[PDB]
């Protein structure tokens, strides 16, 4: 199935910047600051002395805009890519992909390295089409390690079933409000994300109340909600969801196109997966892991053209 010269989706998951606050005793908040050195300037960000802990704050929407293509000139390519989402949700369901995205929120995977050397950290979720009594995860390092520990929370059903209904409905919304509480040691190393300079360390910052403050990248944050990809051959580490899925530590592509399991080689078998899903025999684990990865690239968005 040849790819058009105009194809594009939008992302269904939309994060925001991360704001760093400092909670003194007497329970008041002040945005965290950092330094700047010249003699090539390197910025250093560490907790002040009298602080008690640290808040973080952002917001994610499961917009569910992966239901139909954003722009697609060929109507045969459009009618196929609509039928996979209606067949994935009927034969497999959004329960496996809703749980893996939501664990990355509900533990601190979006807190990249600031988790390291902490005493305890907690997450509190404020879901929007919701009744009340905000969902709170307490003491994640000891209480929550395995997935089961999340499912023993009193409302883990009721929040996966938002993200499913947000992906199932043609206008589904599901806004979340995440807030963390890191109990560091005294004068702790905190690592924010940092700008790109043509070539020593300049942080990405914003302005919160007339003062500079380090902000985790909006793009930096969605790259940790999307660490789901562990469907590659001989998989050990889960990867960030992408086409021909890279690993930036050891600068190599797993799912290289010579493996046959990058995204574009699975899109060309999109008609092939419609006959497998429309039988009655439940398909193999090898051929639904190809479908979990195929849906995670429509949730990611992008442009899928050729020629």
């Amino acid at each position: 199935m040849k790819l058009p010269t105009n194809l594009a989706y939008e992302r269904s998951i939309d994060p925001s910047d991360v704001c760093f606050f400092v909670v003194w005793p007497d329970d008041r908040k002040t945005p965290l600051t950092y330094n700047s050195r010249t003699l090539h300037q390197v910025d250093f960000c560490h907790v002040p002395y009298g602080a008690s802990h640290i808040e973080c704050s952002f917001s994610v929407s499961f917009s569910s805009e992966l239901r139909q293509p954003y722009k697609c000139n060929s109507s045969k390519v459009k009618q196929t890519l609509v039928q996979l989402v209606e067949l994935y949700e009927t034969k497999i369901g959004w329960t496996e992909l809703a749980t893996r995205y939501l664990m990355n929120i509900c533990n601190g995977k979006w807190l990249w390295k600031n988790t390291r050397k902490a005493y305890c950290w907690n997450i509190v979720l404020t879901p929007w089409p919701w009744n009340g009594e905000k969902v709170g995860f307490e003491d994640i390092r000891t209480n929550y390690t395995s997935r089961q520990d999340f499912k023993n929370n009193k409302n883990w059903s009721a929040i996966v079933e938002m993200i499913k209904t947000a992906f199932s409905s043609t206008d589904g919304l599901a806004i979340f409000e995440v807030r963390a509480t890191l109990h560091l040691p005294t004068n702790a190393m905190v690592r924010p994300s940092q700008v790109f300079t043509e070539k020593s360390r300049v942080f990405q910052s914003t302005t919160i109340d007339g003062e500079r403050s380090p902000i985790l990248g909006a793009f930096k944050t969605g790259a940790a909600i999307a660490t789901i990809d562990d469907w590659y051959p001989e998989a050990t580490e889960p990867l960030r969801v992408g086409r021909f899925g890279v690993h930036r530590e050891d600068v190599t592509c797993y799912r290289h196109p010579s493996t046959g399991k990058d995204f574009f080689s699975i899109l060309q078998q999109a008609e092939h997966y419609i006959e497998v899903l429309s039988a009655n025999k439940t398909p193999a684990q090898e051929t639904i892991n190809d479908m979990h990865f195929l849906m995670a690239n429509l949730i990611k968005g992008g442009m899928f053209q050729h020629k």
């Binding site: 950092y34 330094n35 010249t38 003699l39 002040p48 002395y49 009298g50 004068n187």
Partner: protein
């Protein structure tokens, strides 16, 4: 004399020679010597360390046996730089606590005009520090 380093980490190699000079001023407890870095480039120290006012002492004999040795300005220690690094800004609060720490803050724009560092340690304890040396 004027010592020539002929291989080279001169910065870290010149710094061991002062550790002998650190220890030799406790066996005899003098301070009658001077320190002079002639080739103080704006990048390195240079392969010339010189003592002005050694050559027969225990460290420099085995250094000289191998094929590599030959054996105004103000070179002063500047430990005001040591408090600019932000592990010392919180030591300095616990000093001055003896009150609101939250009304103290950072500097957020500092510009350090050509310091220079040579890393060393203690020998009573197991504790490291820096010999900050400028003109």
């Amino acid at each position: 004399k004027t010592i020539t380093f002929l291989p080279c980490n001169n910065e870290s190699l010149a710094a061991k020679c002062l550790r002998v000079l650190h220890g030799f001023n406790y066996q005899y407890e003098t301070r009658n010597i001077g320190v002079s870095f002639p080739l103080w480039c704006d990048a390195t120290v240079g392969k010339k360390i010189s003592f002005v006012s050694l050559l027969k002492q225990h460290y420099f004999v085995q250094m000289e046996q191998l094929q590599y040795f030959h054996i105004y300005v103000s070179f002063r220690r500047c430990q005001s730089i040591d408090k600019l690094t932000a592990a010392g800004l919180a030591r300095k609060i616990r000093r001055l606590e003896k009150f609101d720490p939250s009304s103290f803050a950072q500097k957020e724009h500092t510009a350090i005009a050509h310091y220079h560092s040579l890393g060393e340690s203690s020998k009573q304890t197991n504790r490291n520090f820096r010999l900050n040396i400028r003109m």
